[PDB]
Amino acid sequence: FNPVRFLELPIDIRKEVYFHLDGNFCGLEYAFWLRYDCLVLDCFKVNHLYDGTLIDALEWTYLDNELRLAYFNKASMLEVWYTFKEYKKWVIDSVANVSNIQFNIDNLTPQLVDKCLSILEQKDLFATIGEVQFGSISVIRTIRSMESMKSLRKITVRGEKLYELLINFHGFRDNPGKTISYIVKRRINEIRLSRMNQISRTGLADFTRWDNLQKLVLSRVAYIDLNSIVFPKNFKSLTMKRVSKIKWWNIEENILKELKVDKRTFKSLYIKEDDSKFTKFFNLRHTRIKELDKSEINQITYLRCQAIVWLSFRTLNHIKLQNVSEVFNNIIVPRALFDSKRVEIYRCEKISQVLVIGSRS
């Protein structure tokens, strides 16, 4: 293997090489020489050069009595570790200002979380840190420090014990030190969730307090109910990873309560005509999408059907789905997010019925 022709090789092909080479840099590990490879520094120079759309798992840790950056594997094995002056010097080598650095709480100990936050605050910066990974003394220690945390954009919350205390609106308690301080909620641009089972139980899943959400991630959750969940003003994205059987919106029950027509007669009302033009590019092969017949409806009634679809679907750009394995209540999505590649289902052979409403003219 020649690492001198591989470096004269151009940028995006070398990116596509490192795209399939995310965590496993080696294959138990001789971690002395593995840092000072030219390939690892090439990985981090390209990773800083895009936005961080590669591995991005840069942590602050307190190892060998020193605060240092560290990258962990997909199985949480330590791969590389940098002193901040070193990483600053070779980021300057790449660019010829860092702001996106993750911060776990789960991969650390609270007796060193306190020292990490204390020396990281009093030393130089207490900044350049984007994500905060929650999921109880260390949690309250982190909450007291997020008021000075100038540039954060993400919050991930693990399983249901920590979620209902912090994220949902249901409490409205009298503990200001336990919960957020409302200046951190203004710049909260993304929220991910993980390791839970039900988002809406013991109350209601309402995100109305959190302003300024342009994305949201629901990962590895058992049962959610979209009918219960409300959404903020200026909400954009909706991504759901591997889940079990979930319920969708009540759109088809509202079309059924509009035309005053039965279920079996509506099953003969959903045409499957325009499925060979563009949906063959979607490569679904399991969900045959179906629309409404143009001859079996008027114009203004079709526009009213679209208006019923956009209700409880107010502001959303794209819905991303991994394997969900079941959906109960009758998927019926608008074409304005379906005709462009926004509504993206990827690995769903168990799903069968997708209805799409809108003109494909």
Partner: protein, 524 residues
Amino acid sequence: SKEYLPDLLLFWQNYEYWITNIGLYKTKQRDLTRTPANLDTDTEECMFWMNYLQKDQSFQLMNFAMENLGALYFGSIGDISELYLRVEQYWDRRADKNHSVDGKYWDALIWSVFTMCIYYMPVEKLAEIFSVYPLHEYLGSNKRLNWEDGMQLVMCQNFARCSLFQLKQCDFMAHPDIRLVQAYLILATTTFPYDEPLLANSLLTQCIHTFKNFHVDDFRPLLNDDPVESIAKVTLGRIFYRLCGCDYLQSGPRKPIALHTEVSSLLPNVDVYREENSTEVLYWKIISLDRDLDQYLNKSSKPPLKTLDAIRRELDIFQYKVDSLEEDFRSNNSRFQKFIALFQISTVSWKLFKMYLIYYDTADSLLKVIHYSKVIISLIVNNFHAKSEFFNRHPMVMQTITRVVSFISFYQIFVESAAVKQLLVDLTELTANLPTIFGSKLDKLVYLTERLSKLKLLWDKVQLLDSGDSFYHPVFKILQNDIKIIELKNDEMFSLIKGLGSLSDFRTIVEEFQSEYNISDILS
């Protein structure tokens, strides 16, 4: 050493913003102590160019637009079979001595439609319908000219002026109505925004004020609405997205009031993913990809590769939607729609790989620029055949070639290659074979390319000096002073002072070349 190239390619972005974009189309040298005042008020002139037309000629123009040009007006006005009644009402109401404001609005709309009819008709049909002779009886020009000799553009521009004169008779500032905006969206398909950019910007500011008067934001109708109200919102949405497209095609330092509240695709009060995609918002989405590429021209920062890769992905998505458009080709309206979408998607692909070549110098970026230039050459030469020559008259073929034949010239000054020279010969073959309806504008483009060709020769005979820190050559000084001169010609401080005030062989070679080939010859 051959390391002068990346800074020079970064200088191409500044040169492309100020010479090719602003200074060639969107700059008009005005002098208010020398322009004649409008004491004629365009009354005699548009009186002649309104009673010159007859009835059968008008209905033949309407039939030509009815069976060919539907992809241009179909989003703006709707279906043109409704407008035959309006043409009948105009030819009945022509004898009336008292007009209403609404009738004059319909008359201005159909005169704008007639202007588009004159602009997109080939020379054979236009000679079989209209007569060359009474215009030379009137205009006092040389009596040997024909329609293919440069008199079709004069009749087109005078019909645009007569549409604007019928707008002036309405007191269109005292009565805001939608028939202004629709009329401008028919006049924004000719070379009217490139003839008078000041008047086009003023009418476009009036159209923005007229649209925002209605206070409509969401064009998705509700459930508590009149059916007429819902059809009104749908037509208003189509007019809005066509207006946003025709609004971005005139931007620059003389257009300060933007309508651009339309959020681009995945970097903003109007998020353009919610509308059911017709022809108009599809054209707007391609213009939005174009505007997301070409905002980094005059900026000093570099674009992220995340953005350019998202542009690539969405470029392939809309590329495949153009293939899956699926309409009937027997009516040939879908043919011209397909040509518009395919030429715009090739233009955006070309600009993406030009920025790939300049800012990051990635894998075979120059070769992809050559490939998409050959694709644009194919899409223009394929319409050199019969019955569809006027397809090469839509104004985006004047923009894109102006972007291409400059850049491939500029690179030819500094990097000698084999494929690039043959590509430049193909562009030089294509530039003269463009239709003559772009007139003096087309002529100016050739001059610019010719100047760049001469700028190769001065690069060859003069040796590059070296100071260790920076590099010195007369080509650098001349290319710098071109941007300096045109940025000087877009400074309105001296117009303000005319308003309310009281008032080394290096340098030798630079002054010789600028005295011989002046850049201010390209200014309108």
